[PDB]
Design a protein around this nucleic acid. Structure first.
Ligand SMILES: [K+]
Ligand SMILES: [K+]
Ligand SMILES: [K+]
Ligand SMILES: [K+]
Ligand SMILES: [K+]
Ligand SMILES: [K+]
Ligand SMILES: [K+]
Ligand SMILES: [K+]
Ligand SMILES: [K+]
Ligand SMILES: [K+]
Ligand SMILES: [K+]
Ligand SMILES: [K+]
Ligand SMILES: [K+]
Ligand SMILES: [K+]
Ligand SMILES: [Mg+2]
Ligand SMILES: [Mg+2]
Ligand SMILES: [Mg+2]
Ligand SMILES: [Mg+2]
Ligand SMILES: [Mg+2]
Ligand SMILES: [Mg+2]
Ligand SMILES: [Mg+2]
Ligand SMILES: [Mg+2]
Ligand SMILES: [Mg+2]
Ligand SMILES: [Mg+2]
Ligand SMILES: [Mg+2]
Ligand SMILES: [Mg+2]
Ligand SMILES: [Mg+2]
Ligand SMILES: [Mg+2]
Ligand SMILES: [Mg+2]
Ligand SMILES: [Mg+2]
Ligand SMILES: [Mg+2]
Ligand SMILES: [Mg+2]
Ligand SMILES: [Mg+2]
Ligand SMILES: [Mg+2]
Ligand SMILES: [Mg+2]
Ligand SMILES: [Mg+2]
Ligand SMILES: [Mg+2]
Ligand SMILES: [Mg+2]
Ligand SMILES: [Mg+2]
Ligand SMILES: [Mg+2]
Ligand SMILES: [Mg+2]
Ligand SMILES: [Mg+2]
Ligand SMILES: [Mg+2]
Ligand SMILES: [Mg+2]
Ligand SMILES: [Mg+2]
Ligand SMILES: [Mg+2]
Ligand SMILES: [Mg+2]
Ligand SMILES: [Mg+2]
Ligand SMILES: [Mg+2]
Ligand SMILES: [Mg+2]
Ligand SMILES: [Mg+2]
Ligand SMILES: [Mg+2]
Ligand SMILES: [Mg+2]
Ligand SMILES: [Mg+2]
Ligand SMILES: [Mg+2]
Ligand SMILES: [Mg+2]
Ligand SMILES: [Mg+2]
Ligand SMILES: [Mg+2]
Ligand SMILES: [Mg+2]
Ligand SMILES: [Mg+2]
Ligand SMILES: [Mg+2]
Ligand SMILES: [Mg+2]
Ligand SMILES: [Mg+2]
Ligand SMILES: [Mg+2]
Ligand SMILES: [Mg+2]
Ligand SMILES: [Mg+2]
Ligand SMILES: [Mg+2]
Ligand SMILES: [Mg+2]
Ligand SMILES: [Mg+2]
Lengths: 68, 89, 50, 80, 106, 50, 245
RNA sequence: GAAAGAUGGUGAACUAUGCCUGAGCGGGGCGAAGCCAGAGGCUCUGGUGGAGGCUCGAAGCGAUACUGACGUGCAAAU
RNA sequence: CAAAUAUUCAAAUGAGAACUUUGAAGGCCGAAGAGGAGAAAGGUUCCAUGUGAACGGCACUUGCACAUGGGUAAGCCGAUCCUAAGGGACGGGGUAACCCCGGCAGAUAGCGCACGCGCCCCGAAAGGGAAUCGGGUUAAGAUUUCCCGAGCCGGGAUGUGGCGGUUGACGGCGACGUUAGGAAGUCCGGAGACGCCGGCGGGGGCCUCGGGAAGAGUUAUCUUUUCUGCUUAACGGCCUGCCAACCCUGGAAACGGUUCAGCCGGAGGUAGGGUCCAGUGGCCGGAAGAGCACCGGGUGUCCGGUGCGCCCCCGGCGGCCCAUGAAAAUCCGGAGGACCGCCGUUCACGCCCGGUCGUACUCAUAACCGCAUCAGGUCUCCAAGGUGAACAGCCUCUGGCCAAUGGAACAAUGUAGGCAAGGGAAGUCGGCAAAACGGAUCCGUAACUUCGGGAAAAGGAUUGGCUCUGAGGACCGACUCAGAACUGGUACGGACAAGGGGAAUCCGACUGUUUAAUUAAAACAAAGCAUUGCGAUGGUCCUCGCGGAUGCUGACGCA
């Protein structure tokens, strides 16, 4: 497993062809976005409520999205 | 202190006879002594094995006597070899 | 390798993996897991074991 | 036990060395006294000549604890 | 106190069977098998350690398993000779070569 | 042991099959003299030296 | 009777030498053109211990005369040799301790070790620690040389035989008392299965000619013919004299 | 109905010894060299240090005495 | 039918219960176990259901018996690969043949890119070694094979992006750093890769003290109390950076730095500033969604302290040797630069694949051997609290057990274990057996001596509980050691544990060894002493023969 820091790098990874699904995990602190790729699971931590929503709406329409 | 005559040989206790302990004393002392290194100029040469004498700091290793760095005949042989070499010329 | 090729030529199904063992009675037993989109219960009905 | 009960001669089965080794006591004394000497060389309470002389006297078993060592330092500096 | 067992069929405390105790998220203690301590690269003329390279088992240095910066040092005789050894060889190579010319002239 | 050669396991499988009671209908045959197996072995007695 | 212990050693079953941790044969480099006509320089890289051998060995590296290769040698170290020292082998090598020379190049009185008996032997004489041979005289007509061996015997060798200059390192080893059966046990543990020796008088007659009796005694002269059969040849063999002079 | 003799074979899973490669042996007592300081002029005093086919002893290994028990034994040696 | 402390009550089932099952109680093993798992060996003994007889030396409803079925899943665990001591073996040699010989060298049977080079196999499930983790799941498996999730290794094809062309990258004085960043034959180095002993330091786990919250126990009295739990894997990124090692500046006597011990410095110390190294270290991802504990979906999964503590691993010193303590496969690095341009790329991401055999169970007072379900024998890992010097003995927790035919009664004689007034070896071949001594602290200790010992010589005194006091530290704490008062039926190493001492003679120097199953010794060995042979065309020895051991040896050696 690997962590992603900036939002844009998560955007390109979720747009990868080998990306299969995105899991959204809600914690009491932040919101974790996990995209399952071929070799690694990439996790990005969003500490902002609206940035989580903007990320949710701006995801690629072709990728599956799951709520955890 | 701690002993009047035994010295290093007191590790053997009362065993083996007084004459044998006195015999081994000189070689026990000499083989555990620190010798002068002609290459670097320090008293850092220690016996690594019988005949092998290595300096701690400069790292030179030298073939010498069994229980002393230079045997008496080694000095005599070197002088004979040196005199033969010069007189050969 | 021969096992997964055999199940394909016999039942027209695709095996994801094959685990084999030799039983204490001396025979060989194969565990053939089918790929998703193949339903073993349907295959079991066609063969006749259910 | 902390108050000191049950610690008389009728309760001791090992030797004094087997209970608290003399080497452990000596190691604690050196570390305590060498730390104090280093603490005084820094902060300039003593100079390097005094420190070296006291370091060899500590190894020579001249001071049995801290209070003896500080008193010796004060008396040594009392010269002028 | 949660005594432990070996997890494979090696029953003897050999150097290749060394274990460590770890706590799992299951709240228990299990054995994990470690790797034997390995020397790193060594210098043949000084005997000292070669700086800049980790101390691994020989097959952990494999190219597919280790990055190139970790494997090498950027100097002639990089992972083979230390800096002091390389300086001495350069100076010896040049100074003896000058002596060869002086022998030729004289 | 748990660690077995294949050839040892194959022989152990055959010996497992061979120590069964004789079928009951064998005793009903026309000219039958067989009473019991005469070759049953129990593991605790009569070890097979392999 | 039964086969005696002296006879059983020739089968070499449990009496073979213990050589599992030995560093290799110690000997000169094979004689070649460069040594036969000039000199070749090698450098001493290590002075190491060889189990079962009193004398230290010297690891020496040469450059191959015609191949692009290193040539690593290992012979008995003369006293005074050291790591990083240049040694020279051949006809034109200087008379210095650690150098390998033909006997023709060593004047009368020289101290030598690892002396060849045949030209190209790689060293046969004076190899144990502290031992050496002395050059006595030279014969230019026959091309032979006279040397004195450590046992005192004179020997005639070809003048082309090679020897190292100096005496073998590690001398004085046997002047130290062993003091313990255990020290003797460790000495012979890395040599051979020979150390704890049982006296023949302490045996039964089936095992030894000295065995038997109601007192421990040989019962016949311990001096024995040179031509006695094995099993019979025990004691002092072909002795010209006995006793302490 | 011998004690034997001979021919040709099988065993070092017990035990004997050599070799290779592994594994193992609490806690105490005594306190050798080397080293520090003090006093004297190398000696004395106090420390430090931790040697030895040293010692009391746990595991292990062994087997002295009761000539104990048993002696158709738990056991052809416990 | 008596070793290994031990059973009792109620109920159930059943024709039948001292022996089966459940619950309760009383006990034992006491963590170098009667606990939890392996290697050999066994081979179905493993699990379920059922029960005619036999068997389980009494019994059984019951089973390690019997009958019928079921059960062992791997690219990552092993074997497999490599070599060790060693074994076999082509040609050749010997031999009537069976067969016995491997260094005796025989066109060595082939390897890279015509050209170039050229010094067999077997043998380790404890040696070396590609790569896995956590959680879940069965009647029986998986202590890493199945499921969930998350990785890794090896191999093979292929792009997309990046990177280099001063053809083969930058930065740093330097140690060295950065995910990339030419290259053939040839050559060189390292890792693999190594003994024993003693301190010291570090990390992980465990033990231990406190706080908080959750639940449980006790509760006539007391107890902010006693108990339980409060977790975080491989793998990836960033940080940190021990103890050593290294670099730059500078130039030291009034020498300094420094360890428990050492030791270090003009061959450059102290000091100042840095590089690297390893971690089973920290944070984040994995990952709270899991697991656990509570309450009926919900809550919580937190904060500190301490150490000559115990186990494992690591680091770094010291000591010891007439002892110097494997090899190979495999992997990495380097020297050189023939050759080459739209071609190079050890980079990231992406695609495909991963064979065969073992895997259940026991591992022992019942699964192995001893004719047996035999008090014997049989290699390992883990290992808690108290007392205490302590893996001693004794008691306890986890886990496991009450299986060793049962009942009645206490004769002689036994066996095992005790006590005994007065005497104290008078007993007996003989103090055999038993008793006495025993820990710790203080005092004190002879002859003799190889000066090291003898020595714990001998001989005396003390020891409980309680209430205090003093000393010894770090940046608030832990044990130790001294001192005092009081006090008890003078008892106090209160059980346990734990030398009897002295004066001499004989033998053997000592430590070691030995007649497995009647002799442990004065016997054997041993260091020391002495003698003999031998310079290799040799001595000693083996072999039918050919040949071989000493010998990887050379008189400080071999015999
Ligand atoms: K590097
Ligand atoms: K015979
Ligand atoms: K022997
Ligand atoms: K003897
Ligand atoms: K006789
Ligand atoms: K496999
Ligand atoms: K192996
Ligand atoms: K090894
Ligand atoms: K791993
Ligand atoms: K299994
Ligand atoms: K048994
Ligand atoms: K009675
Ligand atoms: K008497
Ligand atoms: K010979
Ligand atoms: Mg202690
Ligand atoms: Mg059996
Ligand atoms: Mg048979
Ligand atoms: Mg006899
Ligand atoms: Mg005879
Ligand atoms: Mg007859
Ligand atoms: Mg006859
Ligand atoms: Mg054997
Ligand atoms: Mg001391
Ligand atoms: Mg001893
Ligand atoms: Mg003893
Ligand atoms: Mg007797
Ligand atoms: Mg008896
Ligand atoms: Mg009887
Ligand atoms: Mg009986
Ligand atoms: Mg019973
Ligand atoms: Mg008990
Ligand atoms: Mg108990
Ligand atoms: Mg079990
Ligand atoms: Mg069962
Ligand atoms: Mg019965
Ligand atoms: Mg059955
Ligand atoms: Mg399989
Ligand atoms: Mg594996
Ligand atoms: Mg091979
Ligand atoms: Mg071999
Ligand atoms: Mg042949
Ligand atoms: Mg093999
Ligand atoms: Mg292995
Ligand atoms: Mg299981
Ligand atoms: Mg020691
Ligand atoms: Mg500095
Ligand atoms: Mg996390
Ligand atoms: Mg949860
Ligand atoms: Mg342990
Ligand atoms: Mg290059
Ligand atoms: Mg243990
Ligand atoms: Mg205590
Ligand atoms: Mg205990
Ligand atoms: Mg019984
Ligand atoms: Mg009875
Ligand atoms: Mg009485
Ligand atoms: Mg009396
Ligand atoms: Mg009498
Ligand atoms: Mg009488
Ligand atoms: Mg009498
Ligand atoms: Mg007695
Ligand atoms: Mg006495
Ligand atoms: Mg007399
Ligand atoms: Mg004796
Ligand atoms: Mg003895
Ligand atoms: Mg014996
Ligand atoms: Mg006997
Ligand atoms: Mg006896
Ligand atoms: Mg004598």
């Amino acid at each position: 497993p690997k962590q992603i820091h900036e939002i844009k790098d998560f955007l390109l990874t979720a747009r990868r062809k080998d990306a299969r699904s995105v899991r959204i995990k809600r914690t009491k602190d932040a919101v974790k976005f996990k995209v399952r790729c071929s070799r690694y699971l990439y996790t990005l931590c969003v500490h902002d409520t609206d940035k989580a929503n903007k990320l949710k709406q701006s995801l690629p329409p072709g990728l599956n999205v799951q709520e955890v | 202190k701690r002993t009047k005559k035994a010295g290093i040989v007191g590790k053997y206790g009362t065993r083996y006879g007084a004459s044998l302990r006195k015999q081994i004393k000189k070689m026990e002392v000499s083989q555990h002594s620190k010798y002068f290194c002609e290459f670097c100029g320090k008293f850092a040469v220690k016996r690594k094995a019988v005949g092998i004498w290595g300096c701690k700091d400069c790292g030179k290793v030298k073939a010498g006597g069994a229980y002393t760095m230079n045997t008496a005949s080694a000095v005599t042989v070197r002088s004979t070899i040196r005199r033969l070499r010069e007189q050969t010329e | 390798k021969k096992i997964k090729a055999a199940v394909k030529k016999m039942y027209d199904i695709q095996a994801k993996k094959v685990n084999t063992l030799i039983r204490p009675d001396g025979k060989k037993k194969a565990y053939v897991k089918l790929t998703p989109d193949y339903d073993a219960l349907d295959v079991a009905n066609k063969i006749g074991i259910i | 036990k902390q108050k000191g009960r049950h610690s008389g001669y009728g309760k001791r089965r090992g030797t004094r060395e087997a209970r608290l080794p003399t080497k452990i006591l000596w190691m604690r004394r050196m570390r305590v006294l060498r730390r104090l000497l280093r603490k005084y060389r820094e902060a300039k309470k003593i100079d390097k000549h005094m420190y070296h002389d006291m370091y060899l006297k500590v190894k020579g078993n001249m001071f049995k604890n801290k209070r003896v060592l500080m008193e010796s330092i004060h008396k040594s500096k009392a010269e002028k | 106190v949660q005594r432990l067992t070996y997890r494979k069929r090696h029953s003897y405390a050999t150097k290749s069977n060394q274990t460590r105790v770890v706590k799992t998220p299951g709240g228990k203690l299990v054995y994990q098998y470690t790797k034997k301590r390995a020397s790193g690269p060594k210098c043949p003329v000084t005997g000292k350690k070669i700086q800049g390279i980790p101390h691994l088992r020989p097959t952990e240095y494999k190219r597919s398993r280790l990055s190139r910066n970790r494997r090498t040092v950027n100097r002639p005789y990089g992972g083979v000779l230390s800096g002091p050894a390389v300086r001495e060889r350069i100076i010896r190579a040049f100074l003896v070569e000058e002596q060869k010319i002086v022998k030729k002239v004289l | 042991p748990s660690h077995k050669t294949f050839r040892i396991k194959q022989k152990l499988a055959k010996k497992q099959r061979q120590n069964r009671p004789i079928p009951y209908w064998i005793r009903m045959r026309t000219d039958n003299t067989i009473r019991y197996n005469a070759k049953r072995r129990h593991w605790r007695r009569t070890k097979l030296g392999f | 009777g039964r086969v005696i212990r002296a006879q059983r050693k020739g089968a070499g079953s449990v009496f073979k030498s213990h050589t599992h941790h030995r560093k290799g044969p110690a000997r000169f480099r094979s004689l070649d053109f460069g040594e036969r006509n000039g000199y070749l320089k090698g450098v001493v890289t290590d002075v190491i211990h060889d189990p079962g051998r009193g004398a230290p060995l010297a690891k020496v590296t040469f450059r191959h005369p015609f191949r692009y290769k290193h040539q690593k040698e290992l012979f008995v170290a003369a006293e005074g040799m050291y790591t990083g020292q240049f040694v020279y082998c051949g006809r034109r090598a200087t008379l210095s301790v650690g150098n390998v020379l033909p006997l023709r190049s060593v004047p009368e009185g020289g101290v030598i070790c690892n002396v060849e008996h045949h030209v190209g032997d790689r060293g046969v004489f004076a190899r144990a620690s502290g031992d050496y041979a002395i050059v006595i005289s030279h014969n230019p007509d026959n091309g032979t040389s006279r040397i004195k061996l450590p046992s005192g015997a004179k020997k005639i060798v070809p003048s082309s035989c090679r020897a190292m200059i100096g005496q073998v390192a590690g001398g004085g080893r046997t002047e130290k008392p062993m003091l313990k059966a255990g020290n003797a046990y460790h000495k012979y543990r890395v040599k051979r299965n020979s150390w704890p020796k049982v006296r023949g008088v302490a045996m039964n007659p089936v095992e030894h000619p000295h065995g038997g009796g109601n007192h421990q005694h040989i019962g016949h002269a311990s001096t024995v013919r040179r031509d006695a059969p094995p099993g019979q040849k025990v004691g002092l063999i072909a002795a010209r004299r006995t006793g302490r002079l």
